[PDB]
């Protein structure tokens, strides 16, 4: 086993949400933004060396939607069992006061692929500079997701990654501080 490339897609009801992506050894190469009908490369430079026709994802997603309805019926309308996520917060490198870093909120092992994530700094929501990935596939068919928050380490700031998911009875907060 040396390398693995996966084309993963999904459709979810009643949310009417679908996703189409490619990953290489666990990292996302690109996915298709369904509303803009365009290919979004995980790292900007990938797009300078390759291309993918987004409309093709759109056509596959329509078939996936239709197929979900079929299976929903065939299973006698058996719904999915919620599996709550495991959440961990770490920095991408060792922290040094007044030296730029990035907090990473890793949300793993959950399904269905619907989640609410919010970065808190001293209890207040922060949005400047934040980013996130789409839902990434797992061999057990659950999902993983990453959210990021670039920050400047300080001795007084306290951060939280607040996660909500149907498998949880209450918001799950994972704290971090220097």
């Amino acid at each position: 086993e040396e390398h693995v490339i996966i084309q993963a897609e999904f459709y979810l009801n009643p949310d009417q949400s679908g996703e189409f992506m490619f990953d290489f050894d666990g990292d996302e190469i690109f996915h298709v933004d369904m509303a803009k009908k365009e290919t979004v490369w995980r790292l900007e430079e990938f797009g300078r060396f390759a291309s993918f026709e987004a409309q093709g994802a759109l056509a596959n997603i329509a078939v996936d939607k239709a197929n979900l309805e079929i299976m929903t019926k065939r299973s006698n309308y058996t719904p999915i069992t919620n599996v709550p996520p495991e959440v961990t917060v770490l920095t991408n490198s060792p922290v040094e006061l007044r030296e730029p870093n990035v907090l990473i909120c890793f949300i793993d092992k959950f399904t269905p692929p619907v989640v609410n994530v919010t970065w808190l700094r001293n209890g207040k929501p922060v949005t400047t500079g934040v980013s996130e990935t789409v839902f990434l596939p797992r061999e057990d068919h659950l999902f993983r997701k990453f959210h990021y928050l670039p920050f400047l380490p300080s001795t007084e700031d306290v951060y939280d990654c607040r996660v909500e998911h149907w498998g949880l009875d209450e918001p799950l907060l994972k704290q971090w501080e220097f």
């Binding site: 086993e1 040396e2 390398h3 693995v4 490339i5 996966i6 084309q7 993963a8 897609e9 999904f10 459709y11 979810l12 009801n13 009643p14 490619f22 290489f24 050894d25 990292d27 190469i29 995980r42 790292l43 430079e45 990938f46 060396f49 390759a50 596959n60 996936d64 197929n67 979900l68 299976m71 929903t72 065939r74 299973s75 309308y77 058996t78 719904p79 999915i80 069992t81 919620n82 599996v83 770490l90 991408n92 490198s93 060792p94 990473i104 890793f106 399904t111 269905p112 692929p113 619907v114 990935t133 596939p137 057990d140 068919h141 659950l142 990453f146 990021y148 998911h165 149907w166 949880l168």
Partner: protein, 191 residues
């Protein structure tokens, strides 16, 4: 969180597994309803096989389609090998050098002893070897590791920690070997 209407999920996965470049390739196509894989196409098998009773109708129906079968059988080449070559330059050949730092753990359950942390971060690919040395002699016991932590941005990090009772004059070394460098990287900590 609101909206507790039951949910219904359908996933499709086309996995291209490569061994020794493109010498051996295996295509695995799978359908998953909720969290249950129902049917799949394994190139080593050559036809669809239901994984559960729920996917039986599909395996039989698709297998009856000899044109689909032949397309799927040629995909190891037209799909897998083709896509492997498409991004080989920024995937298989991606290399980012690790940043390596060493620091004593700010947390010490009990004085006298100590914990040296070798942080290795921002690297790619995952293949790497981190070793601890004491006065140039490799330390094998007393070393623990987090293993590889994928950051989700095409970068990895790992923490390799050495449990030790440092004595003034000793020289500790964290050494890292990774495909991005031709000579090992070393960072020392002097007690």
């Amino acid at each position: 969180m609101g909206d507790t209407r039951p949910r219904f999920l359908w996933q499709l996965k086309f996995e291209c597994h490569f061994f020794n470049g493109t010498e051996r390739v295996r295509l695995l196509e799978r359908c998953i309803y909720n969290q249950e894989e129902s049917v799949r196409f394994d190139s080593d098998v050559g036809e669809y096989r239901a994984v559960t009773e729920l996917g039986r109708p599909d395996a039989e129906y698709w297998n009856s389609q000899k044109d689909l079968l032949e397309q799927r059988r040629a995909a190891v080449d037209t799909y897998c090998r083709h896509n492997y070559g498409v991004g080989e330059s920024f995937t298989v050949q991606r290399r980012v050098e690790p940043k390596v730092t060493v620091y004593p753990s700010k947390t010490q359950p009990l004085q006298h002893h100590n914990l040296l942390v070798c942080s290795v971060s921002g690297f790619y690919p995952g293949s790497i070897e981190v070793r601890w040395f004491r006065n140039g002699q490799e330390e094998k016991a007393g070393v623990v590791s987090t293993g590889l932590i994928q950051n989700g941005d095409w970068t990895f990090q790992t923490l390799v920690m050495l449990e030790t009772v440092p004595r003034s004059g000793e020289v500790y070394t964290c050494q890292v070997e990774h495909p991005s460098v031709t000579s090992p990287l070393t960072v020392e900590w002097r007690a």
